[PDB]
């Protein structure tokens, strides 16, 4: 019942660029979701030790959280916006796989996703 190592947020070997779209994902998408009232269950990796969740990582093998994504975006870890969008989708999907549909945390992730989906529809040239 240890935690795995968090996901990579930094690799100096990967190449790096700034796009319109990556800047929108940090400053519009991430910022909006980050400041949401329901954001806090997702701002860090699920710590199964401190939270007593011994099944979490027997069930979730591709973990993701908005803290990781935030760091990835600050570190130019992403080259394509789609890599970033996929991490958000993995984070939502994980919440739907682990929690039962009717748990509070699923309703919370659904509100974030709706906001998330509204926001990426506004992603630029």
């Amino acid at each position: 019942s240890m935690n795995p190592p968090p996901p990579e947020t930094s690799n100096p070997n990967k190449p790096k660029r700034q796009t319109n779209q990556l800047q929108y994902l940090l400053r519009v998408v991430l910022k909006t979701l980050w400041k949401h009232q329901f954001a806090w269950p997702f701002q860090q990796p699920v710590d199964a030790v401190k939270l007593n969740l011994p099944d979490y990582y027997k069930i979730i093998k591709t973990p993701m959280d908005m803290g990781t994504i935030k760091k990835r975006l600050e570190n130019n870890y992403y080259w394509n916006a789609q890599e970033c969008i996929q991490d958000f989708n993995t984070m939502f999907t994980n919440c739907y796989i682990y929690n039962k549909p009717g748990d509070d945390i699923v309703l919370m992730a659904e509100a974030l996703e709706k906001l998330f989906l509204q926001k990426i529809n506004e992603l630029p040239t």
Partner: peptide
């Protein structure tokens, strides 16, 4: 905030 949002 005890079980970081999860239902026991």
């Amino acid at each position: 905030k005890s079980t970081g949002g999860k239902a026991p």
